[PDB]
Symmetry: C2
Subunit: 62 residues, 2 copies
């Protein structure tokens, strides 16, 4: 089932978790108007939806 991540063309809604178990930081991105949440590279989310990334960190780290 393709596409995944930002390729779905959905608006990002909220990051609901983060993992670096692969060696690269990834976020679990919940998509607006969807029940789908996909891992996306943090580098990609940082650039495309920085306020969503910042919101996640404020929730988790503050």
């Amino acid at each position: 089932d393709k596409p995944r991540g930002f390729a779905r063309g959905l608006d990002p809604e909220r990051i609901i978790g983060a993992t670096d178990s692969s060696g690269e930081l990834m976020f679990l991105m919940k998509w607006k108007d969807s029940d789908e949440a996909d891992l996306v590279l943090a580098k990609e989310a940082n650039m495309k939806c920085p306020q969503i990334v910042i919101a996640f960190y404020e929730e988790r780290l503050t």
Copy 2:
């Protein structure tokens, strides 16, 4: 002029605290050795990549 009103580009957030009542960043500007406290809310909007790099370096 201190803070963003200095008109200097941010280099990096040195540290963070909420001892003021709100989340604040201690901000290093490029072109200065003098760090300023800025509200996280301001930095989030004016330099989101600098804010993100701080959080990434932490977690």
